[PDB]
Design a protein around this ligand. Structure first.
Ligand code: V4N
Ligand code: V4N
Ligand code: CA
Ligand code: CA
Ligand code: CL
Ligand code: CL
Lengths: 9, 228, 228, 9
């Protein structure tokens, strides 16, 4: 399912 | 290509590119910063990771759309275009892996940096594994597993169970087990043990650290709810 | 660069790129299709417009973020990066304008195609005007105005007041008046007259055409509400 | 304000 979204610093 | 720009200017422009949602630019600036040859600070590591996560995330989403259309169809155009996107995605993963190998991991001696980079190595091999179908698919999967396992071993020796890097590593390794390695029971066991050990360590944390750790614990719980 | 791919394959891949939200690819495929030299059908014109609208829309959003940061600041990095984005945006606008000039407009003889392309010409000069500050800013504004005015003249002679192309042209020309030409009263008058004349022609339409026209009429009303 | 959004075929 969800990995760490990781897209916002 | 960024060789003539100052390191500090590349970092400043990466932050501006993030604000402007220009993630390809952000990734190019952070690649240029890595190629200056100095180690990255915690904030700089996060900029590198955010930039490439956004670039490869758009590619993965496009690949999944095209792969679904291709599977429904079974002219050459859908396959050709899926292959084009797949090759571009592989190129970005190879670029990130190349930065890690030349020379971020070998110079990373503190647990926080070494775990961060080994988690990245596992993640980018995992993205390669998502599209792999040839004679190296097994080897790509083993490369992801090996990177994640080394990161896990370090994190368990050197970090508390609530550390956000440790938690995010465990989350992503559990996703690897569920989605890539066909090991849903290992995924569930890892997510449960990670959550329970973090819960028992929350009492040691400040309000701000508690917020950071519980956010990732909720992601572990969200996966456990979907998997059970 | 697309010279070796069949026209029909470029169109098919543009549609796949839209589904995959790969708008830079979509624009490159549609540029290749235009450069085959044949006129575009209604659906192909829409693919060309959607592709470039998404590409330039991302650039405009990034330029506005960077311009706002630059204005707050008043090192060279913010200005340099805003200039980089601005140059890229100008390059995309020049590419679209070049396709229109070589040779889409000159071969467009039906009102639906000619109005569509002249509206596009006005739009892409308008996007150039948004970033213009030099000695050609007046000339860029006049080029947008002239393209929109020729499209308006054709649309009023050849199309009913509910035609969606006519309505979208009037909407965008009113935005030009309000945002570029410092003519808010002209913007409001054009939006009001366009809305009222469309309202009086709705009775002639099918259910599906009524839905198409009323959607754009609501955009005219939304602007009138913001402007008054 | 709003021009035609124009971003979906
Ligand atoms: C790999 C990783 C582990 C933990 C965190 N964290 O948020 O503490 C992160 O941070 C991110 O990059 C991130 C997490 C969630 C959502 C977004 Cl947009 C970014 C990474
Ligand atoms: C210039 C123009 C005029 C009228 C229409 N229309 O929808 O009928 C369009 O269509 C579009 O490209 C469009 C309109 C609204 C929203 C989106 Cl995502 C696309 C263009
Ligand atoms: Ca230097
Ligand atoms: Ca042919
Ligand atoms: Cl070191
Ligand atoms: Cl013709």
């Amino acid at each position: 399912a969800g990995s760490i979204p990781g897209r916002r610093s | 290509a960024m060789g003539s720009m100052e390191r500090a200017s590349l970092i400043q422009k990466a932050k501006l590119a993030e604000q402007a949602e220009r993630y390809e630019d952000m990734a190019a600036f952070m690649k240029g910063a890595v190629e200056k040859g100095e180690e990255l600070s915690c904030e700089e590591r996060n900029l590198l990771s955010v930039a490439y996560k956004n670039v490869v995330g758009g590619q993965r989403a496009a690949w999944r759309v095209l792969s679904s259309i291709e599977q429904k169809s079974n002219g050459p155009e859908v396959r050709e275009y899926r292959e084009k996107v797949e090759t571009e995605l592989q190129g970005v993963c190879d670029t990130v892996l190349g930065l890690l190998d030349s020379h971020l991991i070998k110079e990373a001696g503190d647990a926080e940096s070494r775990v961060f980079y080994l988690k990245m190595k596992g993640d980018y091999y995992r993205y390669l594994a998502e599209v792999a179908t040839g004679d190296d698919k097994k080897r790509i999967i083993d490369s992801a597993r090996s990177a994640y396992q080394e990161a896990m071993d370090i994190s368990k020796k050197e970090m508390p169970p609530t550390n956000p890097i440790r938690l995010g590593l465990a989350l992503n390794f559990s996703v690897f087990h569920y989605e890539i390695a066909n090991s849903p029971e290992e995924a569930i066991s890892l997510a449960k043990t990670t959550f329970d050990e973090a819960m028992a360590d929350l009492h040691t944390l400040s309000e701000d650290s508690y917020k950071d750790s519980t956010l990732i614990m909720q992601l572990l719980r969200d996966n456990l709810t979907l998997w059970t």
